[PDB]
Amino acid sequence: RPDFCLEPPYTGPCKARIIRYFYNAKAGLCQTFVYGGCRAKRNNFKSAEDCMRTCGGA
């Protein structure tokens, strides 16, 4: 799978509480995390479907 899928979820410097999805490699599935609202890394999706399609592997 893509390299960014293996990186830990990135909240970023902004201080909003935006719920996003990230691929948890250890768990083998996409989960939710708190995104701050800006400067998102690639392991950050607006839906579980998009997260699994992109980071699911296979």
Partner 1 sequence: IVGGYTCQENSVPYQVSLNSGYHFCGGSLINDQWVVSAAHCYKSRIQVRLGEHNINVLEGNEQFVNAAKIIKHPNFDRKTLNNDIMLIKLSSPVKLNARVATVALPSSCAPAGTQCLISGWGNTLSSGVNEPDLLQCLDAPLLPQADCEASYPGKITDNMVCVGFLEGGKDSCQGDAGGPVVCNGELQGIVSWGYGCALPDNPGVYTKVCNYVDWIQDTIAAN
CB of 25 to partner 1, least distance (A): 20
| 47 is a contact residue toward partner 1 (CB under 8 A) | no
| 13 is a contact residue toward partner 1 (CB under 8 A) | yes
Among 1, 6, 8, 17, binds partner 1 (CB under 8 A): 17
Query: What distance in Å separates the CA atoms of residue 19 and residue 1, rounded to the nearest whole number?
Result: 23
For partner 1, the closer CB: 29 or 37: 37
Return all residues near 11 (Cβ < 8 A) that are at least 6 apart. 33, 34, 35, 36
